[PDB]
């Protein structure tokens, strides 16, 4: 249904897709996302339109090669193939308000979701400073995100004799926590963050020690993306809210961090099973 007009590897485990979807492109707003199904027996996954042309009818999606659905898209999809289903726009658009001096953070491929938001904030007259913390081969959208007040790229090393996370570089979260003290050197009116839930908690614990308001792009599991299943539910201000309807963005001071943290890898076992079986493409 939706033609892959462009497909390229813009970095390590990062693919750029320019999809023809005139329905989404004519109506999408910063903070809004899409639900995609790329295969007949495939699942529905949430992705964010990074850029759009309303006239030409296309959206840009940058998918991080994470598992079965994202890897099968990277390997088996080609410029000229079509995505089966692209549903959207979805979610509540980010408020386009005069906040002032904003620090918009993106951990890993999270900067892809910071880009549409940060750009519109800057255009409406906000003094936006973007920050991208990721592995050195994963640096993406440097030139583009360079159209604001000022950009910083803090890039940890993916050490080969080091495993994936703890005690020390998926603990690239240590430096993101360290550089977050951009507070104490500058005055901020708003902190915004797209990153893994545990990383959002650690950063919020730092920003909280100061009185700076904070917004977070929350990533719970999603199925429909239309408010009819409650998989994406989050306790916001003590109330049960649905991130596909009310979010993805929520006030970081209203979120139950401990709850969302436990809800991170509930499907992990099945997720590694799904990848393992597909990887057997010999």
């Amino acid at each position: 249904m939706y033609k892959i007009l462009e497909k390229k590897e813009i970095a390590m485990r990062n693919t750029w897709y320019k999809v023809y979807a005139p329905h989404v492109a004519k109506k999408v707003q910063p903070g809004q996302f899409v639900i995609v199904r790329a295969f007949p027996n495939g699942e529905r996954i949430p992705l964010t339109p990074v850029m759009w042309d309303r006239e030409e009818g296309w959206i840009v999606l940058i998918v991080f090669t994470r598992g079965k659905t994202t890897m099968r898209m990277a390997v088996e999809l080609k410029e000229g193939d079509s995505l089966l289903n692209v549903a959207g726009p979805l979610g509540t658009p980010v408020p386009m308000e005069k906040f002032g001096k904003i620090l918009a953070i993106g951990a890993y491929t999270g900067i892809v979701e910071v880009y549409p938001i940060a750009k519109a904030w800057q255009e409406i007259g906000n003094d936006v400073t973007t920050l991208h913390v990721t592995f050195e081969p994963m640096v993406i959208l440097k030139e583009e995100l360079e159209k604001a007040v000022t950009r910083h790229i803090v890039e940890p090393v993916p050490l080969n004799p080091n495993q994936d996370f703890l005690a020390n570089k998926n603990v690239s979260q240590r430096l993101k926590e360290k550089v977050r003290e951009l507070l104490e050197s500058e005055d901020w009116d708003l902190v915004f963050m797209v990153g893994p839930v545990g990383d959002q908690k650690q950063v919020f614990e730092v920003v909280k020690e100061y009185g700076v308001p904070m917004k977070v792009d929350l990533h719970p599991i999603m199925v429909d993306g239309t408010g009819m299943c409650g998989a994406c539910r989050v306790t916001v201000g003590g109330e049960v809210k649905f991130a596909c309807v009310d979010g993805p963005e929520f006030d970081a001071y209203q979120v139950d961090w401990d709850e969302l943290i436990h809800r991170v890898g509930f499907y992990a076992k099945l997720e590694k099973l799904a990848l393992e079986k597909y990887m057997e493409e010999l």
Binding site: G88, G227, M228, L270
Partner: protein
């Protein structure tokens, strides 16, 4: 005794290992035997007709079979033409209607004996017609005498209300377009009701009729986001809202967000629409524990509990009221009991207990004691262990769905207010099914879709 003819069914042993249809239904032979039990009550005051929400000529289709015992294909074509005058989903309604509170509940033979099995006789007519290609002959007969009228109609939602509205307008010569939020049409027929109750062949055949009638289905289109009602009004002569009531009611009590706690809508969407039980041949995962507790006792809870046991789990149903208070189909309550679902009555969750890893481990209930009065709690409690909790305490319309069109009148519960001809506060815009009634029945959605197609036609004639 002159009791009602029974229907064959697969054994518990075989059916619990798969998702295949449990009740095998009537044969031509058994259908005639059950048809000859009907007393042929006069068409104007026959209580069964009155009891059917859309008033199908029940003795009329029964007598049609009885007079053509000679040729079954003749009898079914005749019985079907009569059913199709008032109902266009007889294979779904005959299987899922709560007859006990409707047609069969009104049947005179029920007062002294068993009432006539109207649902299985209507189902037989439909299934025989579908299998022997009788419905195909009639549909092609309709399509030949169909002339376009230059006029376009948009339909919001592809459930039974929207599917029925589109079919009837196409028959009237309209250029119909359905806007559907999900990747597949059907609504609850595609994500809610399972295969063991409703074989997917009925839905697949219904979408073939609409593809033959020329109706176009626009999937991945969320009205209110993708496009608005105002925008639709600028392109279409008329609109019909059939968006249902799919938002799940979730209690805001301690533990609602522990791992293992699903809403029934999610749990059934993953099975019905996503085929997660076939993981990894299908990519959508599903986690089912050793012990499942289902909260509620409606059809949704029966479907969820019965689906969970087919995944090897031991299931328990926990209900707020008693055995007689259950809203699920009495036939499906029987099926869940034979299949091995345990029933716990007069219990109300007050907390979902979990471990330090945030997984559900137990459910804590308040013992309740026995219409707009409701019940009350005894102050006494009971705790049961659970690895998976499925919430099925109802669904509601998306109370914030209509905020993109404020000129559309909506009430306190999220239901679209309509006039006697099902027209909304906006002329040119009609609405039916769960969007106006809240959570209701397939027959009530079918009928509203049928009624609104007559009103759209009349409103588009002057």
């Amino acid at each position: 005794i002159k009791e009602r003819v029974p229907t064959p069914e697969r054994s518990v042993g075989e059916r619990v290992r798969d998702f295949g249809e449990v009740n095998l239904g009537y044969s031509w032979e058994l259908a005639l035997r059950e048809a000859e039990r009907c007393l042929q009550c006069p068409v104007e005051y026959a209580p069964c007709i009155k009891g059917c929400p859309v008033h199908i000529n029940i003795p009329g289709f029964i007598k049609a079979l009885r007079e053509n015992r000679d040729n079954p294909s003749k009898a079914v074509r005749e019985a079907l033409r009569i059913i199709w005058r008032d109902n266009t989903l007889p294979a779904i309604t005959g299987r899922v209607c709560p007859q006990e509170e409707q047609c069969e509940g009104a049947c005179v033979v029920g007062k002294v004996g068993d009432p006539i099995n109207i649902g299985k006789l209507e189902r037989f007519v439909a299934d025989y017609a579908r299998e022997h290609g009788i419905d195909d002959e009639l549909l092609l007969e309709e399509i030949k005498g169909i002339k376009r009228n230059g006029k376009k109609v948009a339909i919001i939602g592809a459930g039974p209300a929207g599917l029925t509205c589109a079919a009837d307008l196409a028959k009237m010569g309209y250029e119909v377009t359905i806007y559907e939020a999900l990747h597949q049409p059907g609504g609850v027929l595609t994500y809610g009701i399972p295969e063991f109750r409703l074989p997917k062949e009925i839905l697949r055949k219904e979408l073939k009729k609409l593809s033959l009638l020329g109706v176009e289905i626009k999937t991945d289109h969320i009205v209110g986001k993708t496009i608005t009602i105002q925008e639709l009004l600028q392109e279409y002569d008329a609109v019909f809202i059939g968006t249902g009531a799919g938002t799940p009611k979730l209690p805001n009590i301690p533990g609602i967000n522990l791992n293992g706690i699903y809403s029934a809508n999610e749990f059934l969407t993953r099975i019905n629409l996503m085929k997660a039980y076939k993981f990894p041949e299908y990519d959508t995962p599903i986690v089912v524990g050793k012990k499942v507790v289902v909260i509620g006792a409606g059809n949704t809870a029966m479907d969820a509990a019965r689906s969970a046991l087919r995944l090897g789990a031991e299931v328990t149903i926990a209900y707020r009221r008693g055995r007689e208070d259950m809203t699920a189909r009495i036939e499906e309550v029987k099926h869940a009991e034979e299949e091995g679902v345990k029933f716990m009555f007069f219990v109300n969750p007050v907390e979902f207990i979990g471990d330090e890893n945030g997984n559900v481990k137990a459910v804590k209930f308040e013992k309740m004691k026995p219409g707009k009065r409701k019940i009350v709690g005894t102050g006494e409690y009971i705790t049961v262990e659970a690895d998976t909790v499925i919430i099925a305490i109802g669904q509601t319309p998306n109370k914030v769905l209509w905020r993109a069109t404020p000129e559309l009148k909506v009430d306190e519960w999220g239901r679209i207010v309509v006039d006697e001809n099902l027209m909304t506060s906006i002329p040119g815009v009609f609405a039916g099914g769960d969007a106006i009634r809240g959570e209701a029945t397939v027959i009530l959605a079918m009928g509203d879709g049928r009624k609104a197609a007559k009103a759209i036609h009349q409103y588009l004639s002057k």
